[PDB]
Amino acid sequence: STECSNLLLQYGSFCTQLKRALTGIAVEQDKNTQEVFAQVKQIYKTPPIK
Amino acid sequence: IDRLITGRLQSLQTYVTQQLIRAAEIRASANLAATKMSECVLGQSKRVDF
Numbered sequence A: 001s002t003e004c005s006n007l008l009l010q011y012g013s014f015c016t017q018l019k020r021a022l023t024g025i026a027v028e029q030d031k032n033t034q035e036v037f038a039q040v041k042q043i044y045k046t047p048p049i050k
Numbered sequence B: 001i002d003r004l005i006t007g008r009l010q011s012l013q014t015y016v017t018q019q020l021i022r023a024a025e026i027r028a029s030a031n032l033a034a035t036k037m038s039e040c041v042l043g044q045s046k047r048v049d050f
Helices: A002-011 A014-037 B002-041
Strands: none
Touching: A014 B002
């Protein structure tokens, strides 16, 4: 709706900082997974003898 | 004036809420730094990757 967008423009920058907060959470989740699992530099393999 | 007061009050409350969450994160990082100063510097650590 165009009229609602025009009156939503008068409320300032609330959605910019809501988008910034959600983007920070989204980057933080990938950072959490990378710090937990990617702790080894090389990909070691088991020998065929078991 | 009441409309402007409500808008500016909402903006200030939003700022205080993000400041509180960032203060909690900074306090956790400072606790980690204090633990690393106690264990890394004042002694010798046997903890792996610490």
